[PDB]
Every structure is written in structure tokens, then in C-alpha cells.
Amino acid sequence: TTPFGKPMLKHFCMNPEYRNLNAATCGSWPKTVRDQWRRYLDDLEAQPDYFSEVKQGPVIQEARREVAQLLHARVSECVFISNATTGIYTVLHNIPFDKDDVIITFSTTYGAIDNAIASMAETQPFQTRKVTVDLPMRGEDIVARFEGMVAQIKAEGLHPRLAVLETIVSIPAIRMPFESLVQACQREGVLSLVDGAHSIGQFSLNLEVLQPDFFIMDCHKWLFVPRPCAALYVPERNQHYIRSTIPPSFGFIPRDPLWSATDFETIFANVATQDNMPHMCIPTALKFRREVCGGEEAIYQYLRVLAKEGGDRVAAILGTEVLDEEMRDCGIATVRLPLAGPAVHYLSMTLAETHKTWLYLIDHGGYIWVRLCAQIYLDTSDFEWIGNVLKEICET
Amino acid sequence: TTPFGKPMLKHFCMNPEYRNLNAATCGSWPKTVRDQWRRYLDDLEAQPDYFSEVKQGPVIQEARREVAQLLHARVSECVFISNATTGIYTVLHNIPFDKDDVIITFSTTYGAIDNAIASMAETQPFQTRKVTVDLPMRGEDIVARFEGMVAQIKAEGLHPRLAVLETIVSIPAIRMPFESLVQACQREGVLSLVDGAHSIGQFSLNLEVLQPDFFIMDCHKWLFVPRPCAALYVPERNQHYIRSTIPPSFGFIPRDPLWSATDFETIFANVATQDNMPHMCIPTALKFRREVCGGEEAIYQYLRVLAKEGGDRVAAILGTEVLDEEMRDCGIATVRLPLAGPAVHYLSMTLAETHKTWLYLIDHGGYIWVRLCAQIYLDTSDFEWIGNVLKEICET
């Protein structure tokens, strides 16, 4: 119905000047989602407990159902969590790790995940190995060091237990060869934890063909919902591992109340207090996306096509290059700044205050890179806007 | 300014018919809080990242400061958490437990806490003892079995490490002798984890004289803020125990990033994604309470006085009794129903649907009890309202 680009600006709820090149961090939802979001506040403020106890349940069961469809997965294999870090941790914590089990990560693994792994190792006797990845690299050359690491670990007599993988690197943002890495884990006997925080709502995803051991995603990053909102995919063949949430609560299951579906689903049903309304905007966001956006695929292809061109443009104006070896099969472009605390500081100051947009930077190799994010309301003009901005900002 | 009772109905945002005898579960906040809450949504929707990165910090530093004042505690000893269960767990998880350490709980300890303790014991070699408490009991008779348990445990050659205590029992709701129990832990060398989920905003609290080893509270239960909102008190003499949040994240601290106050405070500063707006309504709720409610004490005394009389009234109409041995020094009354799944079900059906109010019940000894909660907008009439309702509901 509405052609994408700036013609979609009227469907959303931002300052007309505000340029959102960073939608995934907090989210970006349409009018019909903020409306229905606000429609759920009233029903909470008009009858708190009847909303809570009766009117909340079924809409959540609906939202699960659509997400399970959007992943080509079974609704019984999908549960809702507060944020990604909770889900990944929830999986890690429930796994009984021996002293000979090895957890494999990469130099692209999210820092919070490394910390989570660092912490468990204090009271648990396992160990870890970090597959060195220094982008730009090729998709098969990553899988090369992976099976190189797994074969060494089996040669040392240890047991490659679990491998942490991500769809998109947080920053520097690329699409990792995660399908290939899931496969290598299948043949070797390694469990594949997939941190797909940037995944659903950005590019097509078929968990039925992928068959990932565990799949985490942040709906609030690309599914047009407010933060925090996530979901956890575990296939039935692995639902036995997860016996409790993090933190634990009433759905706990021991290895052997009256005021109160499979055991796995109730674990994530009887949990401490939660705001569920972001999850209850999944239907209205996925209806917007079928009726206004012309279906999921329509959205994905724009996000990929805006990201390709727009990123190459900004690269030129600055005089640098967009990280690449497709690792750019994503609505994200990570562009290098011509720059080899305060400065880094000041740069961001200008964005939020002066150019009411915002970008993320990172320390790499003799240069600082930035993360640009596409979305159906931006246009190639907007990315050329930021490009020229950044060049002057850079130089100043 | 406004006299309490139904004259305070105009300051809040509920259905005019709706009777809220259960405010603590979800919360009950005034107009000036929902307003300012909504004022923070716009600033998030107008400039997401500048709100997030600049405009969010100081108001949180303010909210901490008032809560630290309201507890007579230092602002450096107080951090914000998402809900209670997170905080209690966060404390439990960080404590290194030996195989000879004993965790002491009671038959009043929250079920989710028991589950949390059950779970850690699977991968950790400690053990536990449960002090049997069958209310109605006297305050000193609880402390009697407590030191009876601690002396036995030291007689068995084990080390009484930690003791889980609560200000208010979740249900059946009473005020436990927690001051006395904190003291007994001081002399014996036992750590006092206080689940004070029902505490702040309901009765005065001086952590400086109490000196609890760890103190958890749910602000959304009695401080006029929306759920979920909590806070964690740890005195400096124990801040060394807590090295990470649950789930872990960037503030982690090992026993030995660039896009980024004591170490304890940063742990709870660098955490995964969060909605902070309930915490940012602490100033506007505590201003309402000093200017409209006539100060904290004014609020407490009503809540205690409404709860005393109102509960005794409902007790009579039914023909039963309010649980008691002051254990009722709280704005909560737990009344026995003349009743010795579906029925229990149906009872609640009627409340939310028919009498658009809501109450909690529980299985006890030959009888089912209910939890009634006072608040500055209810009146003794409202509790006499529910009393007669309940009697007929009961009989039917």
C-alpha cells in the first residue's frame, strides 16, 4: 500500500526531523502499534487483574503463534523472554558442563556472553576456546578455523560441547556464516547456541531447515515492537535441558501452588513479575507488515537493497570502505571512518544534540568504524545525508 | 491537602467503580505519575538515544537518592533491579557456598525463593534447613525456633551461613518479626537476606538501625509506581560479595568496552536492555506523597489504621477471624473465609467480572484465607463492602 522510504514516515511516531539510523537498539514501531500499546495500558488501568489474569493470556498465545510461523518452527518450541542476554544465559545456565567439556566462542561473540561464560567457569569446572576471527574474512574461512578448533579439541581428548554463534555481529556488524556453522556442529556433535539477536524481522529465517540447537532473537530490533522484547527457540529434541528460567520461579522442574501445555512451556509461563505489552504488539506489527509493507519478503529486500547502496555511498564520501569479505545480506552497513575518549565522545554529542540522529562506533585496526541501519522509512537520501555529515564531523 | 479515603479517588487513574483491594501486585499510581510516565514516553519517541544516553541517567540518580533517604541508608549502598525475585536471586547466586554451609529458610519463605535455593543445590554442595512456622504464632516464638535451629546446626558441626527473611509473608500475609531475626543473625554470624518485597512505602523503615545483610524491596507494591520496579540494599561491608548481575553483562568483575561511581554501582549500571521508566516515577510519586498525602508517616498510619479496623469488620460478617498472634502492623489484613479448583476458580471469576475487584486466596488449615490490602483511597466502607460481598459469595 504505502511505498517505502520517506512515504512511510507518516506511519511511524518519531520527530519529523529525527533521522533513525539506529532503529534496532530501542526499536521503531508504527502508529498502529503505539496505539494498540496504549490501548493495553487502559485495560490495565481500568481492570488490572482481569486484564492480567484473563485478557493477557490469549493474545500472548497468538503472538507466539505468528513468530513460530515466521521462523517455520512449531509453536511448542518457542517461548518468550525479556531480552536476548536473558535467553542466551538461560540456555547456558541450564546445561550441565563437565570438566572436560569445551565451550567454543569467537572473537565476534557478544561481550556479555563472554562475561556470562567467564562467570559460570568460576563455580563450574569446564573450559573454553576462542576461534580467532579478524574481519574482513570469507564465510568459508571462518568455518575453516571452526572445524580446525573442533578437531584440535578432540585431538586433546576434550569434548567439544557447545558453540556460541550469532547471526549478526553486534559491532562491527556483519552477517556471519551461521547456517554453515550450525551444519559443522551437527556432524561433530557440538551444540549450536545461536545468538540471533539481529534476525527476525530483518531477513527471512527458516528454523525448520536450519535446525539450530538453540535460537535467541530480539523482536524489538527488526519486528516493529518496543524494547525489551525477545523470544527463545529450542527444538523439542533439546527442551529437556531447560528446567528453569533465569531468575528461577514457580515453573521450576527438579531433576527427579494452589493459586495457579508442556513442562517446557510452563517453565516460561510461571515466572516473576513482567511487563508483557511489547510481546502483545506482535500481532499488530505483523499485520502492519503484511498489509502496509506488502509482506515480510517485501520488507527484507528493501532493507538489504537500501543497506547495500546507501553504505557504499557513505564509504566513498568519507574515502573509506564498508566492511565486507554475502556478509552484507543484512539491512546493516558498517562503514569505516577516516580516523586512526573525548573525541569519540564529542562525535556522538553532535549526533544526538546537533543532527538529532545517532550512530555507534567501535575501536578496530588503525581506524574507527560506524554502524548504519536501514529501515523502510529511510531513503538512500538519508544515508547520503549522514555520509556528508560524518565526513565533516570526522574532519572537524 | 486532600483528606484520605474516597476523597483521594480523584488523584488516581482507575475505573470509578473499580475497587482495588490488591494494589500491591501491579501497583497503583496517581495522575501525576501516569502523566510524567507518559511524558517520558514522548521524550523516548522524540529522541530515543539522547533520552536513553543523557536524559535518563540523572533522574535515576535522583530516584536512588530519595529511596536511600527513605530507608535511612547511603545512596552508594542502594541499586535498582527489575523485580524482587531478581534481587534475592542475584544475592544468592553471588555467594560462594561450601558443602558445610547451611541456608536457613522458613515455611513462610516465598516459593520462588525455595525454588531458587533448590536449583543452586544441584550444582553446588551446600544444604538447607526449614524452620517450621505455622501461624498464628508469636513474634518471639518464631525467633525461638530460629535460634533453636542455629544452635542445632552448630551442634552438628555445620556452619549457619545465610538466613532468608521477609518483612511481609506473601500469603498468608503478616508482618514477621524481622528486626528480631536480623539481630539473632548478628550475634550468631549468620547472614540476613531480607525479602522485604512488601516494605518501602507501607511502613517506616530505617536500615541504619536495622543493619540488614541484604535488603530487597518492590517499590511497585506500596510506593505508588507501576510494575515492575524494585531496589536492592547491600551495606558497604557486604558489597564485595556481589560481582555480577543476573543475567551477567558488562559490569562483571572477575575474582582477579570503548563505547562506555564504585565497582558495585557499575555492576548494576552496565546491564542488558531495560525499561527504566517505573524507576523514573519515584520522584513524582514521593512528591505526591509529601505534598498531597501529608508526608510518609501520614500515609503509613492510615494504612495501618484502615487495615486494623477494616479487616476485623470483614472477619465478623463472615463469622471467622483475621490471622494474628504486632503482626498486623501492616496495611494488609488476611481474613479467613468460612470454607473448609473450580470453586476457588469460580470465586475469583466473580470478583474480576462481577464485582470488578480482586482478591487472593490460599490453602491453609481446614479453611481458605484471603488477603486484603489497604490504600489511601479506600475507606472502611470499601472493606465493609467487600466483607458482605465475600459472605454471600462464600455461601453461594
Ligand SMILES: *Cc1c(COP(=O)(O)O)cnc(C)c1O
Ligand atoms: C542486541 C544484542 C544482544 C543483546 O540484546 P539485549 O536486549 O541487550 O539482551 C546480544 N548479542 C548481540 C550480537 C546483539 O546484537
Ligand SMILES: *Cc1c(COP(=O)(O)O)cnc(C)c1O
Ligand atoms: C511480591 C513478592 C515477591 C516477588 O515479587 P516479584 O516482583 O514477583 O519478583 C517475593 N516474595 C514476596 C514475599 C513477595 O511478596
